[PDB]
Amino acid sequence: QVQLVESGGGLVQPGGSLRLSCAASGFSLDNYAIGWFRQAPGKEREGVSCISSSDGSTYYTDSVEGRFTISRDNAKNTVYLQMNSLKPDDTAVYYCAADYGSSWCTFNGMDYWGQGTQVTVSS
Amino acid sequence: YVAHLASDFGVRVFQQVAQASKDRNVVFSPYGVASVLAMLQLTTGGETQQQIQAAMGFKIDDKGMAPALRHLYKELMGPWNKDEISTTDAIFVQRDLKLVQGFMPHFFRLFRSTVKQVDFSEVERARFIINDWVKTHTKGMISNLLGKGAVDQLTRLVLVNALYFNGQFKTPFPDSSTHRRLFHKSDGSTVSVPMMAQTNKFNYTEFTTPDGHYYDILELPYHGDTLSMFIAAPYEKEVPLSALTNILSAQLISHWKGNMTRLPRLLVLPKFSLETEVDLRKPLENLGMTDMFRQFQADFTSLSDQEPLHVAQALQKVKIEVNETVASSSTAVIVSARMAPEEIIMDRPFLFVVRHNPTGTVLFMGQVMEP
């Protein structure tokens, strides 16, 4: 079964960086659109970043544009989410998502979702 | 199969309703009007019965029809919370009429519901009885069907069909997506109305009508996985809905569904809450069912054969709510437009149908002219 697993979460102080990783044991992600969404306590889930399966295109939500970078390590069958200049408002559980052959991430209706990893930004 | 015959009869009735209301919201139940006219079939005889059976394309007493309709009914109710759907089909007859021997149990055997006897000569008493029956069989939502002075002391027979529906999509629209957006009415004017937004891999087809116009057709599945809402709007603004309305059928909707593929889209859809009361007399008369409404021409001698009898009122009232809560973890993921390069905005009049996908039964259909 394709089972996405997230890693690289943690606790950082405001302004710092994390690098989340997404992989599915036994499967290459290069033919999937891969995205990240997040859920802060009590709030609805929101899409954060996406990388296409077909071209180089990436997509970023308004509040993370210029601070986040999604990218591939094909040798490790992995997608990274570099999160810079983290703010308290970025605290959330972060989820990986994957959809075979798609050009962008709908999040809803995508083939696979991960189980999440905690990111906490606090002094 | 009965599902298609029942649906298509109800769609032909809807077409009569829509042409009389071309620039106003309408919500209607094709299945509902077929179900209650099938019940009326058992009460009628002679030319009155022939007129109904002709319009409907089948006879309720023929081999296999009544049980197929029972299974259809028992099937359309299943995959729902108690808060999401509720229907009633009811015939009310004057209480002091001697009824034909064995009619009441044969009716009950065929439909698993009863003809209701009411004293129409006590007008407010009878109106309260009908109103409370409808109220308590529509989850309390259709709570005042007959207003003051709507029942007459000389009334002897009334038919009512009432339905309430507030189903939850498989992926509810996220509450934080609510906003105001311009809606372009058919007369060229605009109105700013509340809309919601959801990105998904939507089943979608672009349909070309016989007159050469493109329609966007999109499916929104309901959480039970057995019902879906289909939305259909012209690509071009000033195309009237009437042309496509007047070829609709259960098979054509199945044809759309068969041509769909799941495509990534941001969908913007107005919130809407529709309420329609249809006086079924004129639409049914237009389809040839004239005798049932005519005091001395009507033949209801399968119900009662010693007193004259005709339908004083035949009504359908439907209330539907779309996009009005689920748990925060169970609504959609919010996706900003910046992340969604392909979109469909339903900001002009559109047709909708609620369909039972395993049978193709058309449960509801309507037009949203102004949310």
Q: Are residues B201 and A42, on separate chains, in Cβ contact within 8 Å?
A: no
CB proximity list for B248: less than 8 A, separation 6 or greater: B11, B14, B15, B351, B365
Is B1 contained in some domain?
no
**Are B72 and B183 contained in the same domain?**
no
Query: Across the interface, do A44 and B336 touch by the CB < 8 Å criterion?
Result: no
Closest Cα to residue B265, out of B177, B214, B201?
A: B201
Q: Does the residue B13 lie in any domain? A: no
Q: Is residue B301 left, alpha or beta, with left meaning phi > 0 and alpha meaning psi from -120 to 50?
A: alpha
Phi, psi dihedrals of residue B139, rounded to the nearest 5°: 60, 30
Measured N-to-C along each axis, helices B46-56 and B2-19 cross at an angle, to the nearest 10 degrees, of 100
Alpha helix stretches (DSSP H) within B44-144:
46-56, 65-76, 103-111, 123-136
Closest CA to B233 of B348, B310, B144: B348
CB atoms within 10 A of CB A71: 13
B144 by DSSP, 3-state: which? coil
CB of B225 closer than 8 Å to CB of B168: no
The rounded distance, in Å, linking the Cα atoms of B355 and B269 is: 18
* Chain A neighbors of B335, CB-CB under 8 A: 46-47, 61, 105-108
- To the nearest whole Å, the CA of A42 is away from the closest chain B CA by 7
| Angle formed by the axes of helices B30-43 and B46-56, nearest 10° | 150
A101 CB within 8 Å of a chain B CB: no
- The CA distances from residue A8 to A21, A48, B227, B326, in Å, are 6, 16, 41, 31
* β pairing state of A117-121 and A10-12: parallel
If DSSP codes are grouped into helix, strand and coil, which group holds residue B246?
Answer: coil
Measured CA to CA, the distance from residue B281 to residue B2 in angstroms comes to: 24
Residue B360 lies in a domain: no
**Counts for chain B of helices (H) and strands (E), in that order:** 9, 14
For residue B359, tell me if it sits in a domain: no
Task: Name beta bridge partners: B244.
Answer: none
Whether residue B260 is found in the same domain as residue B304: no
Within-domain flag for B18: no
Q: Is residue B367 part of a domain?
A: no
Residues B151 and B72 in one domain: yes
Do the chains contact at A104 and B331, CB–CB below 8 Å?
A: no
Residue ranges with strand state E in B153-294:
157-165, 179-184, 190-208, 214-221, 227-234, 261-270, 272-279
Please check whether residue B219 lies inside any domain of the structure: yes
Report yes or no on B364 lying in a domain: no
**Are B47 and B187 within one domain?**
no
Tell the residue number behind the tokens 């009441």, with chain if given: B104
Phi, psi at B114, each rounded to 5°:
-115, 145
Of B199, B265, B328, the CB nearest to A107: B199
Q: Give the pairing of strands B227-234 and B214-221.
A: antiparallel
- B222 and B261 inside one domain: yes
- Pair B187, B308 in one domain: no
Q: Could B339 and A50 be called an inter-chain contact, meaning their C-beta atoms sit closer than 8 Å?
A: yes
Say how far apart CA B365 and CA B14 lie, in whole Å.
8
Resolution of the experimental model in angstroms, please? 1.9
**Cβ–Cβ below 8 Å for B201 and A99:** yes
Contacts of A48-53 spanning 24+ positions with Cβ under 8 A: A48/A81, A48/A94, A49/A81, A50/A104, A50/A105, A50/B339, A51/A79, A52/A102, A52/A103, A52/A104, A53/A99, A53/A100, A53/A101, A53/A102, A53/A103
Same domain, B184 and B108: no
Q: How far is A27 from chain B (nearest CA, A)?
A: 23
- In the three-class reduction of DSSP (H, G, I as helix; E, B as strand; rest coil), residue A98 is classed as strand
Q: Is A112 on the interface with B (CB under 8 A)?
A: no
DSSP structural state of residue B166: -
Query: Does one domain contain both B73 and B156?
Result: yes
- B334: closest CA of chain A, how far (Å): 4
C-alpha distance from B180 to closest chain A C-alpha (Å): 20
Q: Among candidates B172, B364, B183, which has minimal Cα distance to B270?
A: B183
Of B176, B264, B336, nearest to A106 by CB-CB distance is: B264
Portion 66-95 of A in contact with B at CB < 8 A: none
Q: How far apart are CA A36 and CA A95, in angstroms?
A: 6
Q: Say whether both B207 and B284 belong to one domain.
A: no
Give me the residue from A37, A60, A103 closest to B333, CB to CB. Answer: A37
Compute the C-alpha angle B352/B88/B286, nearest 5°: 60
Domain count, chain B: 2
Domain extent for B328: 165-274+320-341
Q: Can you tell me the distance from the alpha carbon of B368 to that of B371, in angstroms, rounded to the nearest whole number?
A: 6
B126 and B32 both lie in a single domain: yes
The technique by which this structure was obtained is X-ray
Domains of chain A: 4-121 (2.60.40.10)
Residues B296 and B311 in one domain: yes
| B249 and B289 share one domain | no
Chain B positions touching A39 (Cβ under 8 A) are: 329
Closest CA–CA distance from residue B8 to any residue of chain A (Å): 32
| A47–B331 C-beta distance less than 8 A | no
Angle at B78 between CA B166 and CA B42, to 5 degrees: 95
